[PDB]
Write a protein that binds this ligand. Structure first.
Ligand SMILES: O=C(O)CC[C@@H](O)C(=O)O
Ligand SMILES: [Fe+2]
Ligand SMILES: [Zn+2]
Ligand SMILES: [Zn+2]
Length: 483
């Protein structure tokens, strides 16, 4: 509540990877007044970091702290509410992920049913993983979750244990800004990596718990060699296929295959499906995670879909999910491999450091589209576009169809090969991807291009047309082995 008077800081008067803090940078230029010297500051100019904007009831500017001591935070009047500072909320009900709800969930969580052998497969090491994965038909048929106790045989480059946050801030830099989840407030704010470091190392005082979204390091030349996807992931990753480690501008590469995650004990991430129906690898370098997961059945998607567009905020999805939710504990040194569509929440019982990544692959093409449809539906239903969705989803597919599939189909045609003999998978994938893209093309006809579409409609039709033709031709080549 300030007048036409000036900010003591500035002296003036009145997306390729996962990022969420950039949305409410509209608080940056709201005002905070120092409680001592009574000078006013733009939040941005106050010395406060984004995550602290809302914390202090009494703010002391950097010029008064020496004699006032530190700013005073609001009293936690409602531990069971996201708005824990608000007295007018003390009487409302326990919200999921609030401090209250978490500590009450920690006592009961382990009464969540273990999963069936059709849902999750636990193996001792990467060599066994490969055998079991293969016995179930490999990547083209990858449908269950795998937990791999020991990473040997997995061919996944990870740092040696003991590598820790300090190493990360060393590499990325002490000033690097990471999007961090204020867990109790179930919102995302930017925080210096060094500040997170500090908060993390202070094991005694933790008014709020912080857990970082996705520090994606694929463009840090040192980091990107330290922690990588299992080789088998690299071999099936659609993005890696189109943008091989260095055609197609790097500024259009979806950047989600190499993330670092750090989380405090008692951290909770609520149920979701990974953007784009993408699959994930996840190695616990330090700590422990408990995943609560549910199969991607049509019914669980319906259930989950209604849980997300429900205004309700106090019901745990697991509790109204007809028992579909299963518990899996992933311990330090262990690795989790999750294929498309799995619904999951995560509890972090213990201070943790994790390396992981998201990817799209042709073997889950159908499920990826399904999830995509789910996201589109949920978006229409609730304007909560703090959400992050798979960067350049459709563009990825246009490039993949053009650069990869179309080329294969055409080659096969030019030599008169029946693709079913040696390339059946590529053939069935092309048809499914094509059908989905026709839908996109039609939608674009009835309602125009999206706000962000990189590919010009022109280039899209000229691709669609080359494809229809090569597919017709191959369809004839196949029908021709008939009598
Ligand atoms: O480890 C958790 O906090 C979340 C992990 C995973 O579900 C995610 O998509 O980031
Ligand atoms: Fe996830
Ligand atoms: Zn200012
Ligand atoms: Zn002051």
């Amino acid at each position: 509540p300030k007048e036409s008077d000036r900010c003591g800081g500035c002296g003036k008067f009145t997306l390729m990877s996962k990022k969420k803090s950039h949305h409410h940078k509209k608080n940056d230029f709201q005002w905070i007044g120092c409680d001592s010297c009574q000078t006013w500051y733009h939040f941005l100019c106050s010395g406060l970091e984004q995550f602290e904007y809302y914390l202090y009831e009494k703010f002391f500017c950097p010029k008064c702290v020496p004699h006032t001591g530190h700013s005073i935070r609001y009293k936690v009047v409602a531990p069971h509410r996201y708005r824990w500072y608000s007295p007018n909320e003390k009487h409302l009900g326990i919200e999921v992920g609030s401090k209250t709800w978490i500590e009450d969930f920690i006592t009961r969580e382990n009464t969540v049913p273990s999963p069936t052998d059709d849902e999750v497969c636990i193996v001792e090491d990467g060599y066994e993983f490969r055998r079991e994965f293969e016995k179930l038909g490999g990547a083209d048929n990858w449908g269950k979750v795998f937990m791999v106790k020991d990473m040997d045989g997995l061919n996944m480059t990870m740092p040696k244990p003991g590598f820790d946050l300090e190493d990360v801030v060393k590499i990325m830099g002490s000033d690097y800004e990471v999007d961090t989840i204020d867990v109790y407030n179930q919102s995302t704010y930017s925080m210096k990596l060094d500040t997170f470091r500090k908060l993390f190392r202070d094991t005694k005082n933790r008014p709020l718990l912080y857990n970082f979204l996705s520090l994606e390091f694929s463009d840090n030349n040192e980091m990107k060699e330290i922690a990588k996807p299992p080789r088998f992931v690299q071999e099936i990753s659609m993005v890696n296929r189109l943008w091989p480690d260095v055609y197609l501008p790097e500024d259009q590469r979806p950047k989600v295959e190499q993330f670092c995650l750090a989380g405090m004990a008692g951290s909770y991430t609520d149920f979701h499906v990974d953007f784009g129906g993408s699959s994930v690898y996840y190695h616990i370098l330090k700590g422990e995670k408990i995943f609560y997961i549910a199969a991607p059945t049509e019914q669980n998607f319906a259930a989950y879909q209604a849980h997300e567009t429900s205004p309700d905020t106090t019901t745990w999805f697991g509790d109204i999910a007809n028992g579909a939710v299963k518990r899996v504990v992933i311990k330090e040194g262990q690795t989790l491999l999750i294929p498309a569509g799995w619904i999951h929440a995560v509890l972090t019982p213990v201070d943790s450091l994790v390396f992981g990544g998201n990817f799209l692959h042709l073997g889950n093409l159908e499920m990826q589209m399904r999830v995509y449809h789910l996201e589109n539906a949920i978006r229409k239903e609730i304007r909560s576009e703090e959400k992050f969705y798979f960067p350049n989803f459709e563009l990825l597919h246009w490039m993949y169809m053009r650069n990869v599939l179309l080329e294969k189909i055409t080659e096969a045609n030019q030599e008169g090969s029946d693709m079913r003999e040696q390339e059946k998978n590529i053939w069935t994938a092309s048809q499914i991807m094509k059908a989905e893209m026709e839908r996109w093309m039609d939608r674009e006809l009835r309602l125009g291009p999206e706000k962000n579409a990189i590919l010009p409609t022109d280039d899209k039709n000229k691709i669609m047309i080359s494809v229809r033709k090569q597919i017709e031709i191959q369809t004839k080549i196949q029908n021709a082995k008939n009598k």
